[PDB]
């Protein structure tokens, strides 16, 4: 579906709602990485589990396929290959359901 949309209209982001719920997961992780590579587009795969690395790792690879692993807690960028690793802090509204700057 993403492939057909790229040629006909454009495409810039693939935001998949949660991985654990797509249909072993290591074999899916693999495919999502390739998808991003084929379409020259960032793919955002949401995942379900403090937090830290071994919370998701114990359930299907992912770690070595994803090149940036964010955590919502605080936004913890625990792994990225661009460069830096640390904590970015975001405000959250609720009523409006927005995440906002600071």
């Amino acid at each position: 579906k993403c492939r057909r949309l790229k040629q006909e209209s454009g495409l810039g982001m693939i935001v998949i709602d949660y991985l654990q719920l797509i249909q072993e997961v290591s074999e899916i992780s693999r495919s999502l990485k390739a998808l991003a590579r084929e379409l020259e587009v960032p793919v955002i795969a949401l995942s379900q589990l403090r937090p830290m690395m071994s919370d998701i790792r114990e359930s299907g690879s992912i770690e070595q396929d994803a090149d940036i692993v964010a955590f919502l807690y605080e936004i913890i960028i625990a792994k990225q290959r661009n460069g830096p690793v640390g904590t970015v802090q975001l405000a959250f509204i609720k009523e409006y359901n927005k995440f906002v700057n600071l």
Binding site: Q89, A91, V100, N101, L102
Partner: protein, 121 residues
């Protein structure tokens, strides 16, 4: 209504103020909000009327008091004033909350714990 208005519709009715010469004692168990209640009256009497209010804040500091009534205005804070940084919504808010409370008739005295004679002086 007499008086000096409380700000609060149906408190006004039973009392008609707050009027002049009466000693009003507001009592409540720790952390029920007796300060935050007296502050809001003080505020409404300062920002809405044109009548100087004197606040003696024996417990809490003079400036830890002001945010407690800066928050009570511009409807500011979860973001929070305390924990450093704010949103363009908080900033653009404080500025008005600071501006409206700027022209109020509030006088604070935090002097640690003072004898009555001094309050009176």
């Amino acid at each position: 209504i007499t008086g000096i208005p409380t700000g609060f519709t149906e408190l006004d009715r039973m009392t008609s103020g707050f009027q002049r010469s009466d000693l009003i004692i507001v009592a409540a168990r720790p952390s029920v909000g007796k300060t935050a209640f007296a502050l809001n009256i003080a505020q409404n009497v300062a920002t809405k009327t044109n009548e100087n209010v004197a606040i003696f804040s024996l417990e809490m500091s003079a400036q830890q008091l002001v945010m407690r009534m800066l928050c009570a205005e511009g409807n500011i804070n979860a973001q929070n004033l305390r924990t450093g940084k704010l949103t363009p919504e908080d900033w653009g808010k404080l500025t008005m909350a600071m501006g409206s409370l700027s022209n109020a008739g509030i006088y604070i005295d935090d002097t640690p714990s003072i004898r009555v004679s001094d309050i009176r002086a």
